[PDB]
Design a protein around this ligand. Structure first.
Ligand SMILES: [Co+2]
Ligand SMILES: [Co+2]
Lengths: 497, 497
């Protein structure tokens, strides 16, 4: 077999990216400042963190085993609990004490036959008393919110229609439905997309099969009152390339950024309309809604070239690290229209941004606050000379958060400091009476001076100021998505505004 | 109540001394080099690590909650398991989410009445399928070797005669007895010493009550074939000073270093002889044995002033940090002699040393190999300009290990590097056929460059060279004592030579 290294080597696991791989508890975390005593609930986040050194050299950050952090808040005290998801991958490699799963999304490179290849490392959501650890090539893994015990692969009482479950389901605050989909829904390289929803009782509601114009990556999607919307990233999969040891994904300069629109309820596959936005990279959806005229306003990060530069086009053509910027775009769509091409989008701010969050109490409805990560190249904001040699590679950099008010147009910027970077933020309603976007924001910080992580707490009244700074004595390697589960919310999700 | 800080402040918890306070697992530790595949067993060590910030400012290092590390070795793989001892202190302070126990060994400063004040932080030994977490003001706490679960305060099936159990019991390799004692055996300020042993069946054998000339600290002791020996450190306890908020311990320049000698079997209290060594500090016992003439050779670290400088004499007279050196002393005693004063000891090497270990297969018998920590002030060995501002205070420094052959007089010295310091080493017999002192040595390293810990593995054939270097991604705060439990030894202790 390919030799399994006994320590981590490569830029993707160097410095702050070096895996720690701890599981357990750190209770009563050190706090500078004061955590508001009214805050009660848990911040769950997930990071890729390889448990064993890969036999693939420069294994991308996206292929690391999912490790779940939970920050449990009550009366101004906070405890950390940390535990790996017991994926099939994790368990079999642990038993073997060596890596066995090979390249990202390529089963033909695995050293043993896997039934489920999930690393469960992309998102961690709350649904009906369980956490669901998500990875878009697989079903979810279900976990205990309190202990982080892994229950196992989850199929919604045998109702799951698809081989795949998106990392970005949406939670309707009014209907209490979880709105889902999966792409490559019938296996590697398939153009099948399964759109499906579950009601708050756990029963499957919608199930609609449709066909993608290309086998392209659909990472995120958007839900409005009457429509679901699928933006396709121009990364394309050829199974025959994979069979020869090639990458699952490869960029295609020849195609638009397709944006499918399906009616949300009672449709068939042939009701989908594949609109054609100008070529570019579909980033994360902040939110979408229908305006007064019945048109879809889709707000999302959007870039003009391949953000995932490590999977270039057929001739190796693509951008370099740090070259591509994504911007906060509004796209307008009309399901009625028969004009397939779409106009260039209007942009809401000029910042290089990603990881947008809203107040999820207005998800699927008109929103007017958005919180997002920014990467500000303005001199001095990040001390690159100090940070870069300690940072390693593979992971996106964000050196502040921004709060946009869409009514006023005001932006507030939180800048943790010249030697700190941020992950994705969460928003927490102040209480169940609070106005849209009024509450607290938390965000995990990489502190390159200490080589430690910190959890910052911010009041939306003044995002520039840390109300508290929770000081972890270990590193939490840069991660992907996270969510707040408030104690006062019985189903884990906030009440509609 | 005194306010409980919400983060750690002070030299005693700064830099590398900052508590981490994690519990759990890191499996499959990164290894540079190669761990010998024949090594099978567990290295258990204990560190003081305050779980909550004290309300006492500059609480000494000795008053931190005991956290047990276990390094589990098999076929060249190693896993870390880490867990706090569930002392009464730990549990009640966890329940309260604030510190409640006050000053070192002073119940009059506690905010609540404790039954047991143990931090269980000094040593961790194996006895009859349990670990015993030791602290000399208390009985042991018993723990599971495999899971590190705390069973609770342990009293040897209700046979424990003493309120106190030494942190330095001795394990007779021939009789398989655990030889024990406790000082302050009837409570704070008592001059009662209980000497007691247990046979390998768990039944109590010896129990002898004797009287100390002063209420002085007896940290370590020594056991030979026919005698037990109690060196008394000139730190003295006055309960009335304690009732006023004062220190449990205070140095006394007016008294000798008493060395009691009792016959090991069948004695009464009045059989003890209190010999009077020249005034000085009784450090750790390497080992003691009876020679050809029936005389006791007691080999121990010995200093000429108060090593514990933070508890000075009644007028605050005492040394400064880094001033006092301890040296490897041989003392000769004769139980027959009626001459109480003893000669100045002969010294075995020149080095400033502490933490001596032998091959425990010859404990109580003549030994000819000793392994010990050294602190070499010679310029270059330690890059103090770099280390000191990152180190914090409270804990002893050691910048190498030494191996002395007592027959040949040869010394080998392991120097981890200019920016690394060491804890106490363990010795591991190569196999059950191995000669005295032939095997492997492990030692935990503080790496001030990475701010990480590392576990070094050395072959006694060449102590200057690391056979393997196990790289932890977290800090293990400097600790106290540790032990090896070999898999091939059914009762946890090696077979007599
Ligand atoms: Co995502
Ligand atoms: Co000791």
């Amino acid at each position: 077999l390919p030799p399994a290294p006994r320590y981590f080597q490569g830029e993707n696991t160097a410095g702050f990216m070096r895996p720690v791989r701890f599981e357990g508890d750190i209770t009563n975390l050190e706090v500078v400042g004061e955590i508001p005593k009214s805050i009660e609930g848990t911040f769950y986040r997930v990071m890729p963190e390889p448990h064993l050194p890969s036999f693939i050299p420069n294994d991308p950050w996206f292929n690391g085993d999912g490790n779940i952090s939970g920050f449990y808040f009550k009366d101004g005290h906070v405890d950390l609990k940390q535990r790996y998801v017991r994926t099939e991958k994790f368990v079999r490699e642990a038993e073997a004490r060596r890596s066995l799963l090979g390249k990202y999304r390529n089963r033909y490179t695995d050293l043993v036959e896997f039934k489920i290849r999930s690393t469960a490392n992309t998102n961690i959501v709350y649904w009906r008393g369980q956490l669901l650890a998500l990875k878009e090539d697989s079903p979810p893994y279900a976990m205990d919110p309190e202990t982080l015990e892994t229950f196992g692969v989850y199929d919604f009482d045998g109702q799951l229609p698809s081989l795949t479950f998106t990392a970005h389901p949406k939670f309707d605050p009014v209907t209490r439905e979880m709105v889902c989909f999966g792409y490559e829904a019938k296996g590697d390289g398939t153009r099948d997309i399964c759109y499906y929803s579950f009601g708050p009782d756990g029963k499957i509601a919608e199930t609609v099969w449709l066909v993608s114009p290309v086998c392209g990556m659909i990472h995120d999607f958007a839900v409005t009152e009457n429509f679901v919307i699928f933006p396709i990233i121009p990364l394309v999969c050829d199974v025959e390339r994979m069979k020869q040891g090639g990458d699952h994904w490869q960029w295609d300069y020849s195609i638009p950024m397709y944006i499918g629109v399906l009616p949300r309820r009672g449709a068939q596959g042939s009701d989908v309309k594949w609109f054609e936005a100008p070529h570019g990279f579909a980033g994360h959806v902040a939110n979408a809604f229908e305006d007064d005229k019945g048109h879809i306003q889709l707000q999302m990060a959007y870039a003009k070239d391949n953000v995932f530069f490590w999977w270039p086009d057929a001739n190796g053509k693509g951008p370099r690290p740090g070259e591509v910027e994504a911007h906060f775009a509004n796209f307008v769509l009309d399901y009625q229209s028969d004009k397939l091409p779409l106009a260039e989008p209007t942009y809401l701010v000029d910042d290089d941004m990603e990881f947008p969050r809203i107040d999820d109490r207005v998800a699927t409805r008109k929103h007017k606050h958005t919180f997002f990560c920014i990467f500000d190249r303005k001199p001095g904001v990040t001390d690159f000379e100090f940070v870069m040699p300690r940072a390693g590679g593979g992971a996106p950099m964000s050196n502040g958060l921004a709060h946009l008010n869409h009514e006023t147009g005001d932006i507030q910027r939180y800048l943790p400091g010249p030697r700190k970077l941020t992950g994705e933020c969460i928003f927490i309603p102040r209480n169940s009476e609070a106005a849209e976007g009024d509450g607290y924001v938390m965000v995990l910080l990489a502190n390159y001076e200490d080589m430690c992580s910190e959890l910052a707490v911010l009041d939306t009244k003044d995002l520039t100021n840390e109300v508290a700074l929770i000081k972890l004595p270990v590193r939490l390697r840069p991660g992907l998505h996270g969510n707040w589960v408030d104690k006062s919310d019985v189903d884990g999700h906030p009440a509609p505004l």
